[PDB]
């Protein structure tokens, strides 16, 4: 067994293993206690496993939110750093409400952030929203695009239906069988 | 208001660095009066204020050519930021 | 042959270049000296070009 | 160890065909199963030779040979539903070879695919290929523009479309390319910013006159 | 056995290996504990390994974000630093959300930076976006430029479809077989 | 240690052809397999002589040889789909060689390639070489401008094209250069910003552009 | 074996070797702990190796970025230094994003620094870019000059298509064989 | 040790020619491979006398000799596609040499090159040398200006060119100079800005430049 | 064996040796640990080596940059010092990006320094550039001058094509053979 990644954590190792098992190579997760997890593949599967590490940019970076650049435990709290912290928790709450619909597996929402719209004399502009979704297969996915547009429409001050964009897609094929040990 | 928040920090950072040099030279020789006399004491309280005043005007006679140009530059910079 | 290449002229320095092909001096008023013109021009029939440019620009002339 | 046992537990997604040049062809059905079966032969747990084929990659392979040895040929697609007897959809109203030349073309295509037994050549029509693209583009109620010319047609869809007409145009185009291919009829989904979805009129003295399709679009003040 | 790079990082050594294995040479990844990783090659392919180090500019350097130049732990914070540490989080959150589409393997998004619009008396300029992507092969990659452009259009204040440019491509041919040891 | 086992595990991507000058030729098909097979012969694990041929670098070598001994020739490509018998796509309406000089050319081209048994010189029409380049360019809805002249044509694509159009132009140019080559018909894509976005203008015979309420621009035709 | 460079760096020693092996002389890299590497050549190759040191100006200098002249670790920073650190972080990010296109091995992007716009009442000027690229050979690199121009165009505020200059070129011939020791 | 083994592993990128003056010429192909075989002969690991030859250096070496012993000669290039029989391209419409004088020129050029056997002199036409340069310059859509004069033509490519018409002209001039030589026809890629940058002028036979709304200037007739 | 220089740097000692080997005299480099290097020549080659030291002005001085006259250790920074430290970093990044062209061995760029415009009431002047280059021989160095001008034109705000001057040349004949010891 040739190691290729080590020092990972729990959420990263379950994504590198799930990526490699889709392409007929098997990995082994090893808990090193305090140092972190580790992933080992076989020697015929080592040249192919480095190619999918390079392709999929594994291990995954942590997902960034806008409320991390303006932490709550700072000294100064500017109004730009207060409206940027309010709008980030709104798009984190609308995504968790989008996952509770009937047949939705994942979703991501983006609110149009406004920065200099308040401090000038000019009034702030309208609000623009955008959302992705991954649906379970077997559902007529062309018709559920008019329920996300209805749920997202009057959850804000004033948006139009031309300013909301929903891009959704059915999930991939299920992977249920084992990869297979390399015999020689 | 970037020039407003830059000239306010530059004004207070220039206060800390212009008022810190004769204050530390007012207490280096003030400590070299009290620590020196631990043997053959003869201590009088009003004695080191004359040497501290000579030590202040001595280092002001050195830094008089530098204290002027650090104010001449910030003075020409703060009016150019206001007019143009 | 001949011609004038105007690059953001002011309808007085443009019409004085035509004052040689037209054999008379040209007098342009003050309000008609505010409009501007640019482009390569060629002077081989200036009486027909003055009549066509005064209608595309909006102008009146009198000799 | 045979080849159909070295693959996964589900022995129904891969079909092993014995070749004629002493080889063995594995017939996957998409790009994920192609890399699933190529990893087996790449790590090398098989002593004979074996190749993995497809329906797309075996259709761009025998078109490269065909525009060198049979140029100026009109055809649509090669269908591999039964992989031992493929169907060659040839065009009818754009070729002039006789019955004797079609047996030579059906033999030189049989020699390119050693896993096949006999290639069937069917002369499909040429006006039903565009009729099935226009009736299906009118059924989803999409604003289109047909551009008929010699040796192919072209449907263009422009404008500031919404998300339903984008998902419906993508869903119909990918279901039409799988049947006919992009050799005769081509689609031109593009997003500009005008509230008129492609069409444009000019107004003078009697009403509106419909303008010809050109490259320039008028941006929308709205 | 001759070393050419030592003291490398974990994700750096997996890139130098994945570059060398593409050109039919085999490398060896050796750990050293606190001193980092190290990479050795064989003797008859040392000149080619030096040439492909020089050509591809290996070892890689870490990726640059705009929020590393204006750190959050500073004592002072101008409105240019707050306005650029906020554009630099939507710039790398749209990139994280572009990776969850059907077919995308990697993506990169750039936004135009406008800072001095709110300082002086000019109105703010329009926003310009640009994106790159790498799609899984077997996809109709000409019909996928209107879904990235639709998703990117109303995630900001007011952009047009003439200010978004998507340049995307399919991935390279897969590297699965082993390089092969040099016999001598 | 035969040469077909010193390459990779997949014995399908290469094809070893025996030569006439006692040398083995490995025929790759792109540059990645060319550097994969040239690393083997360069590190020295093969005793006899061997070379790595390619589709392109053999097509640019007998075109260096061709314009010294046979200048003023009109040809398109050399096709290597079957490497033991290449096809030489010659022109028809632009050269007047007889049947004996085409046999002399078919023997002097065979003597340059020691892996080829014979060279199949085929003459081809010159109208369909430009008709296939225009009928494929009208299909992709691209603006163009044909410039016919003596001994080659030239298509010029101008304007402010968007991202769909600059990807449909590149896939067609790349799919046409593979078949015909850049000897007769030349493409030229240049893109520039549009002067009239928010401007008002008059088109037709007497055309002009209004750059301001008080500014006229008269473009020269 | 006479020495000619010592006290070098790991990045510098991999470039002196790649220059010397191109001109049919063989060098040896020798580690010396924390005192860096050292490079020794043979006896008859000493007269030529000093000539290519003088010609190619070896050892290389560290590559200079504009953000190194204005460190963020200072206490108070001028707006002339914050805008100069912002443009130097954009200039490195576009360069690291150009290497991810199809066929680009290396790239370098320059940008106009309009640094005296906010000091007087004149409006700010348009921005200019200039890029270089090295492409893998075998590619018709005449049509690749419009993809880089379209990618760089609406990645900024308002550029024109004649304010961008792209000078790109194919790579050199590969060096895969060993130099060879001189007989004595 | 033989010279064929003293070079690199690839025994095809060089070529060893046994000379006539008891020497041994190595024929490289460019300047990167010239210094690879000049380092071998200069560091001293060979016993007999040897030389490294090129095509550009050997074309510039026996053109100095034709500026002394045969002045006012009209020729193009010396081709070394096979190094034992070079082909000398002489001008047909600008020479006055008979059959005997071409033989004594071949016998005097054979003694300069000891590796050759018999120099073959062929007479190239003169109108085709400028016709292939103009028909190649028109295909790339480049603006130009032809200046015919006695004993050579001149193509002038000026103006404010963009980035694609530089790359499309540098690949044509390098492909034309390699096969025809820079002796007869020469190109001038002079990239410069607009003369009279933002100045309105009145061109043609009585010209002036308007430096300002109230300033005239009368140089050469613009 | 009479010594003529001692206490030299490594980079200076390689240039004194590369000058003496051009003129058929053989020198020796002696390492002395902390005290530097030393160049010793033979006995009959002393009256000529002392002539070429005076002629070529050896040992060479370190190359001067403008960013050394205005160090960052100053507590205050005038706008002339900041604009000169900015121009002195673009002046080195442009010449490090000219050596990565095709055929360039070395280069040298000069920018015109305009300092008083950003503080007086006067409008700024145009900006001028001037470059030198050393090319590998066999190059069409008249056609290779029209892309250095194209590369340097729009890396700044507004230059003209006659405000750029490029003076480039080809490299000298190679020195490959050994000098030869003085026999008597």
Coordinates of C-alpha atoms in Angstrom, one line a residue, chain C residues 2-62:
Chain C
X2 CA -7.3 66.7 -52.8
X3 CA -9.4 66.3 -49.7
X4 CA -9.6 67.1 -46.0
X5 CA -9.2 64.7 -43.1
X6 CA -11.2 66.1 -40.1
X7 CA -10.6 64.6 -36.7
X8 CA -13.2 66.3 -34.3
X9 CA -13.3 69.7 -36.1
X10 CA -15.8 72.4 -35.4
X11 CA -17.6 73.3 -38.7
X12 CA -15.6 76.5 -39.1
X13 CA -12.2 75.0 -39.5
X14 CA -13.8 72.4 -41.7
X15 CA -15.7 74.8 -44.0
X16 CA -12.6 77.1 -44.4
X17 CA -10.8 74.1 -45.9
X18 CA -13.5 74.1 -48.6
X19 CA -13.0 77.8 -49.2
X20 CA -10.4 77.1 -51.9
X21 CA -12.3 74.5 -54.0
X22 CA -15.3 76.8 -53.6
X23 CA -13.9 80.0 -55.1
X24 CA -15.5 82.3 -52.5
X25 CA -14.8 83.0 -48.8
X26 CA -17.1 81.3 -46.4
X27 CA -18.6 83.0 -43.4
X28 CA -19.9 80.6 -40.7
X29 CA -22.1 82.0 -37.9
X30 CA -21.7 81.5 -34.2
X31 CA -24.5 79.0 -33.5
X32 CA -23.5 76.8 -36.4
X33 CA -19.9 76.7 -35.1
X34 CA -20.9 74.5 -32.2
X35 CA -21.6 71.3 -34.1
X36 CA -18.6 69.1 -34.9
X37 CA -17.7 66.8 -37.7
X38 CA -15.1 64.1 -38.3
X39 CA -14.1 61.7 -41.2
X40 CA -12.2 61.7 -44.4
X41 CA -13.7 64.0 -47.0
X42 CA -12.8 64.5 -50.7
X43 CA -13.5 67.7 -52.7
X44 CA -14.3 67.0 -56.3
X45 CA -17.9 68.5 -56.5
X46 CA -18.2 71.0 -53.7
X47 CA -21.5 72.5 -54.8
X48 CA -23.2 69.2 -54.5
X49 CA -21.4 68.3 -51.3
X50 CA -22.5 71.6 -49.6
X51 CA -26.1 71.0 -50.6
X52 CA -26.0 67.4 -49.3
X53 CA -24.1 68.1 -46.0
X54 CA -26.3 71.1 -45.2
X55 CA -29.4 68.8 -45.2
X56 CA -27.8 65.9 -43.3
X57 CA -26.5 68.4 -40.6
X58 CA -29.3 70.9 -40.7
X59 CA -28.0 74.2 -42.1
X60 CA -28.9 77.0 -44.4
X61 CA -26.5 78.8 -46.8
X62 CA -26.7 81.7 -49.2

